[PDB]
Design a protein around this ligand. Structure first.
Ligand SMILES: [Zn+2]
Lengths: 190, 52, 198, 175, 156
RNA sequence: GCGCCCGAUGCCGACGCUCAUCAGACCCCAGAAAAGGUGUUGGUUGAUAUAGACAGCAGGACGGUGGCCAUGGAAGUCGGA
């Protein structure tokens, strides 16, 4: 096939700033700065407009499995914008039946200690991703609050903590105890 | 204790799944073709047995 | 439906528009199954109701057929679902006989709350369900007179309330929603001039 | 067969005039063959396929190409093909876009052999017609009538084994 | 209400039956007795057909129920003709009994019908809702969609 | 047959197909099937589309209605003609 052209455009909020040297896109706004270098995506990232209204991803002469990438890069940089302008926050509630999950944050920003799991005397020190602040909340009885800017980072750490607390050689249809990502969110809201 | 909210959230991560009858792989309930390649991306599947 | 119902009712709507010297635009963006009939009872005493599945659609090409001057103040009345009523009465009469039942617009799965309305301390007409459809809101409940009654004086209906079918249940039950638009009498065509009925 | 660049010959034939009737009618075919000997033979193939005549009982009255009408006008052809596919005959309607009808048919043969791996001895063309943009139908062709088209040379690379095997710099694969 | 039966404001729509049945409801007169609080004597006073129970109707007097009359021609049609239970005849009859001059009563006491016009449409729901005997036939009549236009057996 | 072994493409070679955590690569000839794949293309046929068709939004998920009326309980009742 080789479709001659496919395009996508993001309308950048003025309150942000974007620099580029080739595929490396760096986004600096209120909450900080992020980088991401898209090598082997092979597209044209262009920035147009007074007050840099719009960004344009263009894929030339692509095949089907290759036009697939354009909106992926759109969504990636979109979530980057969401982080830099708002910041991502994840919330975790730990289900338990007879062994109240005892989660504390051994060091301030990361290194979550988990213990009293199902009766296991096995402590865990789950190492949160760099650039991610963990914070056990208090308005909800059993609540982890993960915060950061790169949704990749916060969500990766999130699934890591969830998966690190699971049963072995047990029925997961009745035994359920453990932590889970519950309600995907941001820092501040419109 | 398994209060109703924690229950019907945990059973989202651990009960509602779709399984490839030839390769035994957990798939999200939307899935129609197994995401593996040793079963052969087959179409037939089954829902996860609901617990007693 | 198919193109068949389209072809018939395109001419049918202009039939009634030509005949009834008073056209009325009422909205069908959000009207539930019972919120429909509780209005449709009093809509028609010497009258007709005809909302649009192809009738209002025909105007999208009527606009260049020129039956009356100033139907381009009812075709630019297209945004949001609207159908029509037709009577021979006044239009203040028509406004008040779509309010002798006070249509509480009902909604689809995944609705949206646009506005704010302070909670009614006594229920506004409940359907068959529990006191869970009360304490999931935040209004305590007691058993009382033939009116199922609630009890709280705080605002938990907020501009920004996350709506869904889980609330459209209680919307077809209690029947008041934050939404606003529906069966209204404001848009009355008698030979080409628009006023402010309210 | 062994296609080079097809040239669109035209052939007219008949059965020999038997004493029963002074002369049978005359038949015209439009046949794509790289040389007119193969044109003649494939004409006999088609004729024996359709009506009961063979070169034994027929003589080839006329045999020569049709020079292309306006070979400087870009024209997009719809081509009605019928081939055989290792499991049964398939009808098929492909589409191409070129200058000379012969070029269109040679493109059809090449891309049938590639995109469908059916040899050139199992393809028998019915029609090739230049048709307008409102009758062209596959999207691959459809994307090439725009009053303005622009697309860069995305990733351009050329020969440097004649230019030295052992150079001291490295190629630029931008412009 | 479904487990508890709070005093309903009568916009609600719910079953009205069980003039005696102890399958698993555990009562005779109301379906609001066990699930609520009420005696069982107005029900047997009503029990003062034809091998059945009486399909009830239920209203709320701010705490309680008073046995209501069948409020449409639909159930008065079941007051005429196999009145034996488990009949069940498509539908309860073939039409050998006068539905004709009795249906006109129910176009005035129907304070409940919605979306009905000048009586040429009032008659629609109130002659179509009941589904007993084809008015006289073994049909399933669709000549009374709108109950004064295409004609019936009741009217000219 | 022509990257090197190995003489021959060190041609501007032309149009395409394909990603293989066992790729594939030339008569006799030394790797196998029935059955599957929303892997990726080509094609046949049938449905619908600006009068917006398709997903995600304004509907709509019952108002008559216990309407027939099974009472084997069932405005849904399944197992109610
Ligand atoms: Zn599988």
């Amino acid at each position: 096939m080789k479709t001659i052209l496919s395009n996508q455009t993001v309308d950048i909020p003025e309150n942000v700033d974007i620099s580029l040297k080739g595929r490396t896109v760096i986004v600096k706004g209120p909450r900080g700065t992020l980088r991401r270098d898209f090598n082997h995506i092979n597209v044209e990232l262009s920035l147009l407009g007074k007050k840099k209204k719009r960004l344009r991803v263009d894929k030339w002469w692509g095949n089907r499995k290759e036009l697939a990438t354009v909106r992926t890069i759109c969504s990636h940089v979109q979530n980057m914008i969401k982080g830099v302008t708002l910041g991502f926050r994840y919330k975790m509630r730990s289900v338990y039946a007879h062994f109240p999950i005892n989660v504390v944050i051994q060091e301030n920003g990361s290194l979550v200690e988990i213990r009293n799991f199902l009766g296991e005397k096995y402590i865990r020190r789950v190492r949160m991703r760099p650039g991610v602040a963990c914070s056990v909340s208090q308005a909800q009885k059993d609540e982890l609050v993960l915060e950061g800017n790169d949704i990749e980072l916060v969500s990766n750490s999130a699934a890591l903590i969830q998966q690190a607390t699971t049963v072995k050689n047990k029925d997961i249809r009745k035994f359920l105890d453990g932590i889970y990502v519950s309600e995907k969110g941001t820092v501040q809201q419109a | 204790i398994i209060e109703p909210s924690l229950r019907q959230l945990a059973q989202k991560y651990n009960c509602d799944k779709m399984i490839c009858r030839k390769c035994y792989a957990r798939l999200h309930p939307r899935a129609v073709n197994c995401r593996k390649k040793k079963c052969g991306h087959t179409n037939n599947l089954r829902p996860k047995k609901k617990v007693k | 439906d198919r193109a068949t119902w389209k072809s018939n009712y395109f001419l049918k709507i202009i039939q009634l528009l030509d005949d009834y010297p008073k056209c009325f635009i009422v909205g069908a963006d959000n009207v539930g199954s019972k919120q429909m009939q509780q209005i449709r009872m009093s809509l028609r005493g010497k009258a007709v109701v005809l909302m649009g599945k192809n009738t209002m659609m025909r105007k999208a090409i009527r606009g260049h057929l020129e039956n009356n001057p100033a139907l381009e103040k009812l075709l630019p009345h297209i945004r949001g679902n609207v159908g029509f009523v037709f009577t021979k009465e006044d239009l203040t009469e028509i406004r008040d006989m779509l309010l002798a039942n006070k249509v509480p617009a009902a909604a689809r799965a995944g609705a949206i709350a646009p506005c704010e309305v302070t909670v009614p301390a006594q229920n506004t007409g409940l359907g068959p369900e529990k006191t869970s459809f009360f304490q999931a809101l935040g209004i305590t409940t007691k058993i009382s007179r033939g009116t199922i009654e609630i009890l709280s004086d705080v605002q938990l209906i907020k501009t920004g309330d996350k709506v869904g079918a889980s609330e459209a249940t209680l919307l077809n039950m209690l029947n008041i929603s934050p939404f606003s638009f529906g069966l209204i009498i404001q848009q009355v065509f008698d030979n080409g001039s628009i006023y402010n009925p309210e | 067969k062994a296609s080079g660049t097809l040239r669109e010959y035209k052939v007219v034939g008949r059965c020999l005039p038997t004493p029963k009737c002074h002369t049978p009618p005359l038949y015209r075919m439009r046949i794509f063959a790289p040389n007119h000997v193969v044109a003649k033979s494939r004409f006999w193939y088609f004729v024996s396929q359709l009506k009961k005549m063979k070169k034994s009982s027929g003589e080839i009255v006329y045999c020569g190409q049709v020079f292309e009408k306006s070979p400087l006008r870009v024209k997009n052809f719809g081509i009605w093909l019928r081939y055989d596919s290792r499991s049964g005959t398939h009808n098929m309607y492909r589409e191409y876009r070129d200058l000379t009808t012969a070029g269109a048919v040679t493109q059809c043969y090449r891309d049938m052999g590639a995109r469908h791996r059916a040899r050139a001895h199992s393809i028998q063309i019915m029609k090739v017609e230049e048709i307008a943009a409102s009758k062209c139908r596959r999207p691959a062709v459809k994307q090439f009538h725009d009053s303005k088209i622009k697309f860069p040379l995305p990733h351009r690379v050329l020969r440097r084994q004649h230019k030295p095997r052992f150079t001291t710099k490295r190629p630029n694969t931008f412009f | 209400m479904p487990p508890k039966f709070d005093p309903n404001e009568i916009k609600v729509v719910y079953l009205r039956c069980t003039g005696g049945e102890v399958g698993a409801t555990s009562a005779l007169a109301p379906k609001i007795g066990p699930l609520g609080l009420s005696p069982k004597k107005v029900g047997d006073d009503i029990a003062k057909k034809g091998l059945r129970i009486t399909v009830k109707l239920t209203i709320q007097n701010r705490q309680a129920q008073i046995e209501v009359v069948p409020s449409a021609s639909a159930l008065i049609i079941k007051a005429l003709p196999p009145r034996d239970r488990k009949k069940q005849k498509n539908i309860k009859h073939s039409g050998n009994i006068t539905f004709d001059e009795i249906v006109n009563i129910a176009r005035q006491m129907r304070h409940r019908s919605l979306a009905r016009e000048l009586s040429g449409t009032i008659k629609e729901i109130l002659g179509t809702a009941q589904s007993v005997g084809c008015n006289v036939d073994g049909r399933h009549p669709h000549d009374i969609i709108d109950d004064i236009n295409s004609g019936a057996v009741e009217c000219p």
